[PDB]
């Protein structure tokens, strides 16, 4: 806290959807103590062994003969560290990995796979510390979530349908900050996905609801978008002090 | 930040500037100097620009488009095709080749835009280099009319012949390593 | 819109991205205040 540098404290763009923008302590700890957003989830960690076995099965020749070769072997498969080999085809591997994430064979919902198309590197991180949030999946311009899923969830009890079933269907996905860098998001399905003057026609995900970017204390603030930003931090602080 | 941009020059203000003044810090964050012009140079923009050029530090690197080191066995051989003409001109009445010539050639090429912006002259640059370094560096300069502004630098002629050194016949820093050291020195320290 | 401009007024209500950018600006202001308090106090003690 003693350090006066106004750089560790500032609200980074990457904090979007994973740490509450408004809720921060004020004083020596401005921007140094943060609070999870409402929908944020933190990885509990997993063994990387099955992912490595899958990569070995697909291709990812290791101990190759200087085959990177001006990254002719597109991408270099990394895991939680550990360059573990490289693949000639990097789009097929990524798509196969997403399908596996859906079927939940080798990829738990938390396993995070990042492809940097330039720099040719895929990172496949499962390291127990990543903060990730649920985002809906957009195929073409259509959300995968449909009336069947919503109707079943509406009948939730005595229908034995829950959030985990929504994840299993592949309708929703957990995306961490690294993946948030490689994903085109739409705030709303109707306003953004639908055809208009084409800003983007390659949306890959959609926010479940914008308001979730706020934390527990900031969520109580009514009409927070109509207030000055410091006034929401103050309300977070004061709501921690309300009597009830 | 939030300072009004009256001029394109940043200035420390507020608490940090008060800290600098009160501490009498030897190193100000933004040391700046306001210069007022005595004569008609103040009224006329061209003379003021002349003063600006005279008051602004310019290194050879700022005006140098690209530098190359070619091993040229003979000056007449002219490994670079382009210099063949102007080398010939200079070697129609060769000067300072009597001692010898260096077998290595540093063919620096200057950007015309930077030269004309700073209003530098090929004779000016060549005089600064040759005079400051001494007779050891011999420089051939292109005509400004030529499309490429080329300065051909060679190591000491007497040093190449080794009659002047006498002593022991042992290479010091080879010649190409010495030429690279010369190039770095020129890039950052010419102070043209 | 991409780099931070908020066309909506407070009464109209900020759009989500405008909301996050506004939060970034307010956070910078708060950090400035908190950091300023200690440096100014040290200066004042020295002068006195």
């Amino acid at each position: 806290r003693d350090g006066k540098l106004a750089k560790p404290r500032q609200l980074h763009n990457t904090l979007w959807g994973m740490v509450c923008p408004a809720e921060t302590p004020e004083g020596h700890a401005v921007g140094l103590v943060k609070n999870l957003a409402l929908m944020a989830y933190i990885s509990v960690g997993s063994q990387p062994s099955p992912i490595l076995e899958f990569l070995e099965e697909w291709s990812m020749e290791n101990l190759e003969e200087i085959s990177p070769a001006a990254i002719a072997d597109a991408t270099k498969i990394f895991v939680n560290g550990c360059w573990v080999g490289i693949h000639k085809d990097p789009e097929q591997l990524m798509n196969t990995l997403r399908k596996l994430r859906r079927q939940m064979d080798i990829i738990v919902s938390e396993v995070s796979m990042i492809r940097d198309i330039r720099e040719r590197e895929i990172r496949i991180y499962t390291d127990a510390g990543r903060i990730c949030r649920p985002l809906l999946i957009v195929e073409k311009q259509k959300l995968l979530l449909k009336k069947r899923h919503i109707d079943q969830l509406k009948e939730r009890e005595y229908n034995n349908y829950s959030w985990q079933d929504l994840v299993a269907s592949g309708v929703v996905e957990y995306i961490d900050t690294l993946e948030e860098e490689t994903v085109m998001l739409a705030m709303t399905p109707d306003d953004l996905q639908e055809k208009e003057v084409a800003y983007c026609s390659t949306y890959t995900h959609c926010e479940i609801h914008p308001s979730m970017i706020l934390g527990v204390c900031a969520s109580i603030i009514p009409f927070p978008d109509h207030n000055q930003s410091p006034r929401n931090t103050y309300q977070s602080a004061m709501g921690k002090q309300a009597m009830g | 930040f939030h300072y009004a941009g009256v001029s394109a020059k940043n200035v420390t203000l507020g608490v940090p500037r008060l800290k600098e003044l009160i501490n009498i810090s030897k190193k100000p964050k933004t040391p700046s100097l306001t210069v007022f012009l005595l004569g008609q140079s103040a009224r006329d923009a061209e003379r003021a620009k002349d003063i600006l050029c005279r008051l602004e530090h310019t290194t050879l690197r700022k005006v140098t488009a690209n530098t190359a080191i070619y091993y040229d066995p003979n000056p007449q051989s002219t490994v670079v095709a382009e210099d063949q003409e102007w080398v010939n001109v200079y070697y129609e009445m060769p000067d300072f080749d009597v001692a010898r010539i260096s077998p290595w050639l540093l063919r620096v090429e200057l950007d015309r835009k930077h030269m004309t912006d700073r209003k530098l002259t090929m004779e000016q640059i060549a005089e600064k280099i040759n005079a400051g370094f001494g007779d050891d560096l011999n420089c051939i300069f292109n005509d400004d009319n030529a499309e490429k502004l080329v300065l051909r630098i060679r190591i000491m002629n007497s040093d190449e012949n080794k009659m002047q050194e006498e002593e022991e016949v042992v290479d010091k820093m080879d010649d190409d390593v010495f030429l690279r050291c010369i190039e770095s020195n020129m890039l950052t320290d010419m102070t043209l | 819109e991409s780099r931070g401009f908020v066309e909506n007024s407070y009464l109209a209500g900020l759009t989500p991205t405008e909301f996050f950018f506004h939060a970034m600006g307010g956070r910078e202001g708060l950090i400035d205040t908190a950091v300023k308090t200690a440096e100014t106090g040290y200066i004042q003690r020295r002068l006195i």
Binding site: Q228 | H2 | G25, E28, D32
Partner: peptide, 8 residues
């Protein structure tokens, strides 16, 4: 939060 010349 206003502009570059104002406040954040």
């Amino acid at each position: 939060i206003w502009g570059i010349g104002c406040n954040p």
